[PDB]
Structure 1
Amino acid sequence: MFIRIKCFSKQPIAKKVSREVSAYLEYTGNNTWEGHISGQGVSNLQTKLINVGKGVKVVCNYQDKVLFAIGNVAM
């Protein structure tokens, strides 16, 4: 299932995101991750992006909708 994660966060809390989102998602460019995942992969990635810290502004796009709105994101 095709998801696309964009991290609109600050850089010290973006390397800690990029440690965990790049476990499941390909790097397509400029703090955005686009690649293929399963539903339990979605659940595990949301769980381990919630638990990293504060300021984890992250938007996930399934099709053209949104999956997560972690942090006070601009979306």
Structure 2
Amino acid sequence: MFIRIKCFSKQPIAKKVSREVSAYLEYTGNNTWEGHISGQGVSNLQTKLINVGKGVKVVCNYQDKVLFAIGNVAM
């Protein structure tokens, strides 16, 4: 399953969210990751992206359907 994470956060909440999601996907770049990961591993990524704290800014794109959007996402 091929997903894409886009981050639009602020430092140091950007620093820590980049630290956390860069453990799961390849860094395609400019605070945007893309890679292959199972959907229940995607749920694991969701679970510890929620627990990582507030002000956090993550959107997902499985194909292009928004698999999960965290925060008041601009899109």
TM-score category of the 2 structures, normalised to the smaller one: over 0.9
Cα distance in structure 1, aligned partners of 2:63 and 2:11: 27
The Cα offsets for residues 5-55 of structure 1, whole Å up to 9 and x where unpaired, read as: 001111210111111111110000100000110012100000011111111
SS in 2 for 1:15: helix
Give runs of ≥4 in structure 1 deviating > 3 Å. Answer: none
**Unaligned segments of structure 1, at least 5 residues:** none
Alignment: residue pair count: 75
SS in 1 for 2:4: strand
Q: TM-score, normalised by structure 2?
A: 0.94
**Unaligned segments of structure 2, at least 5 residues:** none
Identical residues among aligned pairs (%): 100
SS in 1 for 2:20: helix
Cα distance in structure 2, aligned partners of 1:58 and 1:64: 15
SS in 1 for 2:3: strand
